Amino acid sequence: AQTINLQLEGMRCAACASSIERAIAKVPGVQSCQVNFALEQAVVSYHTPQILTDAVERAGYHARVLK
Ligand SMILES: [Cu+]
Numbered sequence: 001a002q003t004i005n006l007q008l009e010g011m012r013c014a015a016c017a018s019s020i021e022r023a024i025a026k027v028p029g030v031q032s033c034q035v036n037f038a039l040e041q042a043v044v045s046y047h048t049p050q051i052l053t054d055a056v057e058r059a060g061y062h063a064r065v066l067k
Contacts, residue, residue: 001045006053008040008060022042027051029046041066051065 011017017035024033024044030052032045042063044052049065056063 001047003043003045004052005066006042006044006063007066008042008055008056010060011037011040019059020056020061023055024052026051027055 011020013051014037017037020042021033021035024030024042027046029047030044031047032043034043035041043055044062046052053063
């Protein structure tokens with residue numbers, strides 16, 4: 001697969017982590033997602049990084065790919 005790391009903004013509580021995890025899981029192609037709450041980071045494996053960041057932004061959070 002391919003794996004990307006995202007730096008997120010706007011997570012304020014566990015419900016935010018859940019919303020983001022759900023937004024990512026509704027993206028066709030995604031295989032796996034983990035969120036680091038304190039650091040506002042996600043690691044996502046998928047089968048379109050722009051697809052992922054766009055989904056997170058639609059859920060109401062900022063997202064950028066880390067390189
Ligand atoms: Cu929240």
